[PDB]
Amino acid sequence: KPKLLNKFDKTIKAELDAAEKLRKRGKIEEAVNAFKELVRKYPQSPRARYGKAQCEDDLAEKRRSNEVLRGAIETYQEVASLPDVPADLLKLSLKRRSDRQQFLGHMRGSLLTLQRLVQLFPNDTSLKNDLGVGYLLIGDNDNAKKVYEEVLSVTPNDGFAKVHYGFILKAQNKIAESIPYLKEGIESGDPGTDDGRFYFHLGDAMQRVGNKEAYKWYELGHKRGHFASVWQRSLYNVNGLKAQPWWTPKETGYTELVKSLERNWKLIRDEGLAVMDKAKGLFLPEDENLREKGDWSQFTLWQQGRRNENACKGAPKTCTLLEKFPETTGCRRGQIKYSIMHPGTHVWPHTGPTNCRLRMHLGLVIPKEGCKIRCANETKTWEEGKVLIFDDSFEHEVWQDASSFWLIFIVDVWHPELTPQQRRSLPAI
Amino acid sequence: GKCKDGLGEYTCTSLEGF
Numbered sequence: 001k002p003k004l005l006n007k008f009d010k011t012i013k014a015e016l017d018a019a020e021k022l023r024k025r026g027k028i029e030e031a032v033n034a035f036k037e038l039v040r041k042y043p044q045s046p047r048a049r050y051g052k053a054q055c056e057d058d059l060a061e062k063r064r065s066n067e068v069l070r071g072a073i074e075t076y077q078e079v080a081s082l083p084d085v086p087a088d089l090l091k092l093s094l095k096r097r098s099d100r101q102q103f104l105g106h107m108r109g110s111l112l113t114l115q116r117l118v119q120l121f122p123n124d125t126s127l128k129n130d131l132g133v134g135y136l137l138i139g140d141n142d143n144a145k146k147v148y149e150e151v152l153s154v155t156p157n158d159g160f161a162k163v164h165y166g167f168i169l170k171a172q173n174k175i176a177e178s179i180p181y182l183k184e185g186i187e188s189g190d191p192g193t194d195d196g197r198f199y200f201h202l203g204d205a206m207q208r209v210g211n212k213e214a215y216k217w218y219e220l221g222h223k224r225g226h227f228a229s230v231w232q233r234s235l236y237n238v239n240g241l242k243a244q245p246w247w248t249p250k251e252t253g254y255t256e257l258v259k260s261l262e263r264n265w266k267l268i269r270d271e272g273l274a275v276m277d278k279a280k281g282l283f284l285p286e287d288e289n290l291r292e293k294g295d296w297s298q299f300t301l302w303q304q305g306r307r308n309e310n311a312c313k314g315a316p317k318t319c320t321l322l323e324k325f326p327e328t329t330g331c332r333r334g335q336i337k338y339s340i341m342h343p344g345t346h347v348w349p350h351t352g353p354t355n356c357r358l359r360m361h362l363g364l365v366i367p368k369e370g371c372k373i374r375c376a377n378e379t380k381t382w383e384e385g386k387v388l389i390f391d392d393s394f395e396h397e398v399w400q401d402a403s404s405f406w407l408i409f410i411v412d413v414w415h416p417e418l419t420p421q422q423r424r425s426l427p428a429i
Numbered sequence: 430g431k432c433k434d435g436l437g438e439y440t441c442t443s444l445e446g447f
């Protein structure tokens with residue numbers, strides 16, 4: 001029973017209720033004028049001001065307008081400025097302000113709102129959980145870690161804080177440490193804990209430590225609608241796209257691209273070798289904590305469908321070749337990159353983020369022994385000048401145990417069943 | 430940070446309003 005009416009607002013409760021009804025019934029433009037009149041007669045009224053903000057919120061939804069939402073965001077702020085705001089209404093208004101600030105990508109501003117909310121309600125642990133999510137969204141795992149520690153100091157049983165703390169630990173490569181927190185947080189069943197991200201990383205942490213229990217959690221995640229399957233564990237998915245670990249060129253439909261990669265493979269190889277020899281610093285160590293051991297670096301020509309101009313200066317013929325194929329240069333959920341691994345390298349079993357791409361590998365320098373890739377239950381080898389294709393949303397793994405280096409060219413393509421408008425509008429990954 | 434090869438980030442996309 002949220003108490004939103006301060007003493008004066010109770011004296012005008014009738015007019016407020018009539019205005020909110022118009023907003024309930026959907027007469028948006030009618031309610032913005034009803035609440036404008038209430039804001040006129042009663043300029044200090046928090047409930048009138050909240051009505052104006054909610055209507056501005058709904059108007060941003062119909063019109064799909066960032067500018068009108070900015071105005072709503074300010075009005076939600078104005079509610080909190082007025083005298084004598086009831087606590088429930090104050091909390092409702094600033095929470096919704098932060099949420100819509102996150103909508104707009106004003107992640108720094110959302111953070112100030114959340115920090116104020118925690119300052120205003122230091123006993124609300126859920127507001128602290130929300131604050132930590134704000135830190136997580138701007139990539140500040142350090143402050144997010146501290147926040148969930150503080151939650152757990154006061155409410156050790158809070159499941160939301162548990163999983164988020166585990167997520168952070170796991171992201172920090174505190175693999176063993178993260179398992180109990182992720183596991184207990186999911187088992188709590190608290191709101192916000194039934195999230196694919198936590199099934200994803202609990203199972204992966206279990207795998208890395210050798211806990212055969214890892215797949216129990218993948219099944220539960222599949223059963224709760226988060227994973228397409230136990231083997232295919234991507235989280236940014238389009239449902240219905242055909243799903244198989246290995247593809248032939250013909251199945252993908254990108255027959256002309258495969259032809260061109262294989263016909264011109266040595267120019268791609270030679271430019272890659274030239275960068276190894278003369279510009280080796282362009283190869284960057286893979287830094288997503290996917291390397292179990294060894295030496296593994298990548299030289300990226302395209303990411304998120306954008307050409308890296310300086311990188312293409314080091315592979316000019318290759319970039320010229322690839323420009324003819326928007327199915328890969330426009331794959332805003334994939335990359336185009338050389339990859340090199342040296343002997344004694346092992347890539348952890350892992351999954352890519354999206355089922356919306358397929359990953360091509362063109363072999364460039366493949367030692368005759370020592371090198372292999374598993375996708376799902378099938379392990380294959382590369383050939384120099386030949387293309388392999390797999391769906392890297394399926395769990396896959398690579399070993400490099402040869403006596404010399406391994407070099408391939410990676411070309412991501414849109415999943416062939418994605419329509420042109422899907423390819424144009426899916427957010428970049 | 431960006432989710433190129435994996436799913437390590439809390440969110441892999443960036444919201445830019447409507």
Ligand SMILES: O=C(O)CCC(=O)C(=O)O
Pocket residue numbers: 298338339340347359392396398410434
């Ligand atoms: O990521 C690389 O550079 C090669 C191995 C791999 O896991 C992939 O191609 O997805």
Ligand SMILES: [Mn+2]
Pocket residue numbers: 350352392396434
């Ligand atoms: Mn991979």
